[PDB]
Design a protein around this nucleic acid. Structure first.
Ligand SMILES: [Mg+2]
Ligand SMILES: [Mg+2]
Ligand SMILES: [Mg+2]
Ligand SMILES: [Mg+2]
Ligand SMILES: [Mg+2]
Ligand SMILES: [Mg+2]
Ligand SMILES: [Mg+2]
Ligand SMILES: [Mg+2]
Ligand SMILES: [Mg+2]
Ligand SMILES: [Mg+2]
Ligand SMILES: [Mg+2]
Ligand SMILES: [Mg+2]
Ligand SMILES: [Mg+2]
Ligand SMILES: [Mg+2]
Ligand SMILES: [Mg+2]
Ligand SMILES: [Mg+2]
Ligand SMILES: [Mg+2]
Ligand SMILES: [Mg+2]
Ligand SMILES: [Mg+2]
Lengths: 121, 145, 50, 119, 116, 203
RNA sequence: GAUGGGGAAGCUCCGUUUCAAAGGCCUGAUUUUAUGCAGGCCACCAUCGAAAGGGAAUCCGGUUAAGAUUCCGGAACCUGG
RNA sequence: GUUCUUUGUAAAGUGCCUUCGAAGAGUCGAGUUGUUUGGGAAUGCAGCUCUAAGUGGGUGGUAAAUUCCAUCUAAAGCUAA
RNA sequence: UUGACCUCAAAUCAGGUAGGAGUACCCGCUGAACUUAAGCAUAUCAAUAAGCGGAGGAAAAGAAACCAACCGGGAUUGCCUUAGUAACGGCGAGUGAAGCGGCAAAAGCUCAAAUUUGAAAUCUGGUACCUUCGGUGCCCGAGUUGUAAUUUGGAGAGGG
C-alpha cells in the first residue's frame, strides 16, 4: 500500500524497550557491613605538646584519621561520638603516611573539657 | 684428520646430541613398577588370566616363513566354526581380528581346534549366582603353548 | 619536588619508617644471627630511584 | 580473656550488634590510654573479640541466606563450591555417564563375563 | 494462479496434521482401549493428512505414492528444490510452484515447511 | 531423502545453475563482514555429513581469507643470511588457507569448539569457508553422548594444535610408507631418531 | 590512542570519522505509579595530552623551635542550591 | 555377601531362502613454484591453474603405453596402557 | 487494517562461557647464524636456537585408501634389532630411514548417505512439586531447510 514518510536521508537506530535487571539470584546475598564506621574514621587523638597547645588555646581538637576518610565523614563522626558540633575541619597527610585532622569546635563548646572527658589532657 | 692405517668411521655427533641423551638408570625401577602393575591388574580381574588367547598363525617374509608365530585375533570365520559369535568370544577372552583371512587350512583348523580346548578348559561364572572359586592362573598363553 | 604526586609521597612514608636502627631486644633472642640493619639507607650515599 | 565463640552463637543478631558497638567503645578508650602507659597488651584481646563477634555475625547471616536459597538452582556464587575453575567446568557424573541407546543395548546384551581358566 | 492457489489451499486445509494437543488425548484413548478393549492400537481410524517434510516427500515421488505435491518458490538455498520439478516430471507426479513457504508452514502448524 | 541429489548436484560446479549461484553468492559474501554469523549452512548435506546437526549448540560462521602466497615479513627483503634463504616472493606457508580460516573463527568465538570446515565459494582474492562450531556449555550438547566428547578439556582449540580435518591433513599424518617423516608427529619422531639411548650395561 | 572496520599465521598493524542501525535535550501528561506511552528537538560522533598555554572567586595584621595568601582576628569574593 | 524393586506382552543373539545393500568433491588426481625428506623423472606439505569416476578409487620406491595380479577403501569422527 | 515468515539489530534482558600465569614433557607455525667443508656459494650445523599460537597429567597417534609378495601378516605406541644399511650428497664434507623378528602393553569402535508417516516418536528453557551431580507434571520455544529409533562395510537392511 503506502510507505512511511521519511523527511531525513539519515537512518538512525530505532529506540527499543530496555529491560530492567531481574536476577535469579543476588550478587553476594550478604551486604557488606559499613566499611567506614565512625569508630574507624577516627581512632586515637594526637598528644604531641604542640597539639595540646591547639586544644587549650585554639579550641581545636586533633585526631589521627583513616586515610580513606574525608571532611564530611570526620565532621559527621565527631558530632556523633562526642555529641559536639564542629565549626570546620582541616586535614593533612603526615610525612609518616597517616592522616591528621584539625577539628575546630564551635564556641558553645570547650575543647579542653572534651579532651579530658575522652581521657587525655 | 687422517693419520694412520685406520678404518673409516661414521660417528654422527655433530648436532647438539648432548641435549638428547637417555640413560636408562630407571631400568630396575621401571621393571619393579611393571611387576607391581601386573599384580594390581591381576587383583582387579582376579578370576581372569590377565591376557587373551592368541591364535597360532604362519609368519610372512620368506626369510621367516619357516617358523610359526602367535597371532592377534581369531578370524571371525574361525570363531563361527567354533560355534560362537564374535561378540560373545571377545567377552570371554578370545581376541578377534576382522582383517585377516584364511588361506591355509592347516592354520585354520589348528586355530579352530585351538578354540575348542579353550572352551573346554574354562569355567564361565553365571551372571547371577554362586560364582565358584577360581584359583586363577596368570597367563593363558602358558596354558596353550 | 615540593609539588609531588601522592604515589611518590606514599613511597615517602615507607622510606621514613625503613630508616631506623635495629631494635635492641632483637639482640637477646635465642638463635639470633641478625647483627644489624643491613638494609639501611641514607640520602647522602644511596638514592631510592623512585 | 575475651569473649568465646560458642556462647555467642546462642544469641540473636540485635544482641550481637549491641555487643559489637560496646566492644568498639573500649578499644577506643584503651587506645587513648595506650599512649599514656609505656605498654598495654590488653588491647590484643579486645581486637580479637571484635573479630570473633564479626565472624559470628557473618556466620549467622550466610546460613539464613543458605536456607533462603535452599532447594532451588541458581544460588549466589559465593555460596557455591570453590573446588577449582576446571572442576566446576568439568562434566558431571550424570552427563559423563550418559550413553546412546545403541551402545546401551550392546552393554546389556554382551557384558564382560567373569570367567576362570582351570578346566 | 491465486484463484487456483486459493482453491487448493481450501482443499489442503481440510487435510492438516494433528496438533500437539489432540495427539495427547488421542493416545490416551488408545491407552484406554488397550486397558479394556485390548485392541492392537488399531481402534483409531486410518489418518488422512498432508505429507510434509522435504526428505519425506522426495521418497514419496520416487515411490510414485504422492498424488500431488507443492513447492515453495523462496527456499534460501535454491539448490534444495531445483531438481525436484524435474524429478516429478520423470515420475509423472503433478507438481505446483506456489508462493510462500510461510503459507505452507501455516498449513502444517509450523513456521516454514517448504513443501507439501 | 534429497541429500543424495544435493550432494551429487554440488559436484557439477561448472554447470550453468551452479556457476550462476556461485556468481551471485560470491558478491554477497564480499558485501558482509569478513567473519559473520550464518543463520543456516549453505550446503545442508555437506555440513551434516561433517558432523553438523539441526539443533541448539550448533553454530555456522562464514569466513573469507585472502588467497595467494605468504610474503616474508622482512624489512625491504634483506634477509641477512646465505643466498639459500634470500627468497622472499615465492614462499608457501605450509598450513592451508582452510586451516587459517578456522583459527581466526576460533579466536572470534572462543566459547565454542571448532569441529569441521568446508569450501563454499572463492574468487581471485578471497576464499570462502563455513565452519561447524559446537557449544560445549549447552545442556543439549553436555548430554547426547554422541557429542559430549567435545566437552572434555583436552579438545580446547583443536584448530590451533591442528586436530581438525584440515590440521591432520596439513600435519601429514597418515598410515603408509609415504608418510615416514610425519606418522606420529614430525618433531616427535625426529627427537626419537636423534636420541642416543644408553643402558646400564652398554651394548 | 581504543571502538566500527580492514590486514597479519601471530605477537599485533593501519586508521580517528573513516563503506556504523554509533544518542541525550528539555517541556508537558500519569498523579493504580512509576515513569512507558503524548510529542517535539538536535547531528559532534570515545579518550588522553601543559603544576610556564586558556582558567570563577582573598586581602591585611598577628602567631611557631620548625606551617601559613592554608592557622587566629578582621574584612571580602565566586560557584551551586 | 544381605535386602527391596522386575525391569518385561520389552530388548538382544543365532539358521534357512529371496531382493537389495545407499559409503564422504574445488576433494582425489594432474601441471607449475617454493620448501622439506634418505625418497632418487620428483617423500610429504603448501600457493596458483585444470579437474573427475564408480566392476570405481589409492598403493605395489624408475618415467610412459599396452595386458594382468595382489592389497586396502580416503577426502567425517571418538578411544585407556 | 491485521497476522505470519526470512534476514538483521538492541537490551546493566535470564543463564553461561573466553582472555592471564607456568610451560620440564606435549601439538603446530615461523625461523636463523656461529661452525664443518682446512677457502667458499649447494650442503652441514638444522627441518635446531630465538619468536608466535594451543592442552593434559600425560599429550599426540590409534583401529589401514597398511605392511607385504610370503605357507602371507594385521589399530596405535615404546625398547633391542634392522643399521651407520637401502638411499640422499660441489656422490666432496656429510647426512640416513622403513618391512619382517623378539619383547612391553593391549580395547575397541560411531556418524552422514534408507519415509516411522498409522501419528517429531526428539531436545534446551521457564514454572510448580520432589527423594536434587537429578527426577515428574505443566507451559513456551527449537526443529520437517530433519531432532528420535535402526545400519557403519567386519557389514547390514526389507521380506517368508
Ligand atoms: Mg590540603
Ligand atoms: Mg597471504
Ligand atoms: Mg592504533
Ligand atoms: Mg585532559
Ligand atoms: Mg594549565
Ligand atoms: Mg596563547
Ligand atoms: Mg583578589
Ligand atoms: Mg617557611
Ligand atoms: Mg579566616
Ligand atoms: Mg619453513
Ligand atoms: Mg617437492
Ligand atoms: Mg637472520
Ligand atoms: Mg670453512
Ligand atoms: Mg679453519
Ligand atoms: Mg671464512
Ligand atoms: Mg624455542
Ligand atoms: Mg589423545
Ligand atoms: Mg585423536
Ligand atoms: Mg638433515
Amino acid at each position: 500500500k503506502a510507505l512511511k514518510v521519511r523527511t531525513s536521508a539519515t537512518f538512525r537506530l530505532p529506540k527499543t524497550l530496555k529491560l530492567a535487571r531481574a536476577p535469579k539470584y543476588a550478587s553476594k546475598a550478604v551486604p557488606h557491613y559499613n566499611r567506614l564506621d565512625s569508630y574507624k574514621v577516627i581512632e586515637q587523638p594526637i598528644t604531641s605538646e604542640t597539639a595540646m597547645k591547639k586544644v587549650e588555646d585554639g579550641n581545636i581538637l586533633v585526631f589521627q584519621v583513616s586515610m580513606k576518610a574525608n571532611k564530611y565523614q570526620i565532621k559527621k563522626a565527631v558530632k556523633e561520638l562526642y555529641e559536639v558540633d564542629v565549626l570546620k575541619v582541616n586535614t593533612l597527610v603526615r610525612p609518616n603516611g597517616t592522616k591528621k585532622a584539625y577539628v575546630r569546635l564551635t564556641a558553645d563548646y570547650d575543647a579542653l573539657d572534651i579532651a579530658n572527658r575522652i581521657g587525655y589532657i | 684428520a687422517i693419520s694412520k692405517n685406520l678404518p673409516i668411521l661414521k660417528n654422527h655427533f655433530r648436532k647438539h646430541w648432548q641435549e638428547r641423551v637417555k640413560v636408562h638408570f630407571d631400568q630396575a625401577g621401571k621393571k619393579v613398577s611393571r611387576r607391581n602393575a601386573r599384580a594390581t591388574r591381576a587383583a582387579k580381574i582376579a578370576p581372569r588370566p590377565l591376557d587373551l588367547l592368541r591364535p597360532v598363525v604362519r609368519a610372512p617374509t620368506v626369510k621367516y616363513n619357516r617358523k610359526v608365530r602367535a597371532g592377534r585375533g581369531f578370524t571371525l570365520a574361525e570363531v563361527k566354526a567354533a560355534g560362537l559369535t564374535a561378540a560373545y568370544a571377545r567377552t570371554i577372552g578370545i581376541a578377534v581380528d576382522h582383517r585377516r583371512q584364511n588361506r591355509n587350512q592347516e592354520i585354520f583348523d589348528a586355530n579352530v581346534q585351538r578354540l575348542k580346548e579353550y572352551q573346554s578348559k574354562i569355567i564361565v561364572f553365571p551372571r547371577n549366582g554362586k560364582a565358584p572359586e577360581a584359583e586363577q592362573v596368570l597367563s593363558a598363553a602358558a596354558t596353550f603353548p | 619536588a615540593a609539588q609531588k604526586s601522592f604515589r611518590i609521597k606514599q613511597k615517602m612514608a615507607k622510606a621514613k619508617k625503613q630508616n631506623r636502627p635495629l631494635p635492641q631486644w632483637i639482640r637477646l633472642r635465642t638463635n639470633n644471627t641478625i647483627r644489624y640493619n643491613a638494609k639501611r639507607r641514607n640520602w647522602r650515599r644511596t638514592k631510592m630511584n623512585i | 580473656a575475651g569473649v568465646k565463640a560458642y556462647e555467642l552463637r546462642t544469641k540473636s543478631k540485635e544482641q550481637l550488634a549491641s555487643q559489637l558497638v560496646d566492644l568498639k567503645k573500649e578499644l577506643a578508650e584503651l587506645k587513648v590510654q595506650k599512649l599514656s602507659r609505656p605498654s598495654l597488651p590488653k588491647i590484643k584481646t579486645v581486637r580479637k573479640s571484635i573479630a570473633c563477634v564479626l565472624t559470628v555475625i557473618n556466620e549467622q547471616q550466610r546460613e539464613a541466606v543458605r536456607q533462603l536459597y535452599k532447594g532451588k538452582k541458581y544460588q549466589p556464587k559465593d555460596l557455591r563450591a570453590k573446588k577449582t575453575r576446571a572442576l566446576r567446568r568439568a562434566l558431571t557424573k550424570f552427563e559423563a555417564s550418559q550413553v546412546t541407546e545403541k551402545q546401551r543395548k550392546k552393554q546389556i546384551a554382551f557384558p564382560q563375563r567373569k570367567y576362570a581358566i582351570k578346566a | 494462479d491465486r484463484n487456483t492457489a486459493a482453491e487448493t489451499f481450501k482443499l489442503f486445509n481440510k487435510y492438516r496434521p494433528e496438533t500437539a494437543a489432540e495427539k495427547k488425548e488421542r493416545l490416551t484413548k488408545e491407552a484406554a482401549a488397550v486397558a479394556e478393549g485390548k485392541s492392537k492400537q488399531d481402534a483409531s481410524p486410518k489418518p488422512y493428512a498432508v505429507k510434509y517434510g522435504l526428505n519425506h516427500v522426495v521418497a514419496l515421488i520416487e515411490n510414485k505414492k504422492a498424488k500431488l505435491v507443492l513447492i515453495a518458490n523462496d527456499v534460501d538455498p535454491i539448490e534444495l528444490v531445483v531438481f525436484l520439478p524435474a524429478l516429478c516430471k520423470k515420475m509423472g507426479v503433478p507438481y505446483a510452484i506456489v508462493k510462500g513457504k510461510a503459507r505452507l508452514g501455516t498449513l502444517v502448524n509450523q513456521k516454514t515447511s517448504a513443501v507439501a | 531423502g534429497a541429500y543424495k541429489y544435493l550432494e551429487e548436484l554440488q559436484r557439477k560446479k561448472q554447470s550453468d545453475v551452479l556457476r550462476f549461484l556461485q556468481r551471485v553468492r560470491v558478491w554477497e559474501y564480499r558485501q558482509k563482514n569478513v567473519i559473520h554469523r550464518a543463520a543456516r549452512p549453505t550446503r545442508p548435506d555437506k555440513a551434516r555429513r561433517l558432523g553438523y546437526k539441526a539443533k541448539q549448540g550448533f553454530v555456522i560462521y562464514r569466513v573469507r581469507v585472502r588467497r595467494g602466497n605468504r610474503k616474508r615479513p622482512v624489512p625491504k627483503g634483506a634477509t641477512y643470511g646465505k643466498p639459500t634463504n634470500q627468497g622472499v616472493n615465492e614462499l608457501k606457508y605450509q598450513r592451508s588457507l582452510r586451516a587459517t580460516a578456522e583459527e581466526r573463527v576460533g579466536r572470534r568465538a572462543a566459547n565454542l569448539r571448532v569441529l569441521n570446515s568446508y569450501w563454499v565459494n572463492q574468487d581471485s582474492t578471497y576464499k570462502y569457508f563455513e565452519v561447524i562450531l559446537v557449544d560445549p556449555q549447552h545442556k543439549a550438547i553436555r548430554r547426547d553422548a554422541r557429542y559430549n566428547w567435545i566437552c572434555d578439556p583436552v579438545h580446547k582449540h583443536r584448530e590451533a594444535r591442528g586436530l581438525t580435518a584440515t590440521g591432520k591433513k596439513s600435519r601429514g599424518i597418515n598410515k603408509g610408507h609415504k608418510f615416514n617423516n610425519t606418522k606420529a608427529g614430525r618433531r616427535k619422531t625426529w627427537k626419537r631418531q636423534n636420541t642416543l639411548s644408553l643402558w646400564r650395561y652398554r651394548k
